Amino acid sequence: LESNTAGDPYTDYEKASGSFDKAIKTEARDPLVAAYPIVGVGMEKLIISTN
Amino acid sequence: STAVQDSNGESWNTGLSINKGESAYINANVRYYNTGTAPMYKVTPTTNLVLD
């Protein structure tokens, strides 16, 4: 009763078929695992310039 | 008594101010190259400038 079971931009057929972007991991091909990025930032150093 | 004094001098000053936040500006002369199979139009690279 849902065209997008996982709630992501890709329908159940596009996911199961692999007809979406080719850089999406293969676990996100089944309709119950969301194709979904988890992006975070990390600081490596901080530099101060006295005015 | 009566005195009359006549003077004349001259001075010379040199200064130098320095900003410690922006003490210089840098200018990089660069050049792009393509080693692939297709051309690129409107080439816009992003570059790091690293000191240490």
| Cα(B7)–Cα(A44) distance, integer angstroms | 66
From residue A41, alpha-carbon distances to A38, A44, B4 in Å are 10, 10, 80
User: Entry resolution in angstroms?
Assistant: 2.8
Chain B positions in Cβ-Cβ contact with residue A47 (cut-off 8 Å): none
**Contacts across the A-B interface (CB distance below 8 Å):** 8
Nearest to A36 by CA among A51, A17, A15: A15
The span from the CA of B5 to the CA of B10, in Å, is 17
- Any chain B CB within 8 A of the CB of A44? no
CA distance B19 to chain A (A): 7
Q: Which residues of A touch B22 (CB under 8 A)?
A: 49
Angstroms from A36 CA to nearest CA on chain B:
26
**Residues B52, A43, A28, A1, Cα dihedral to 10°:** -150
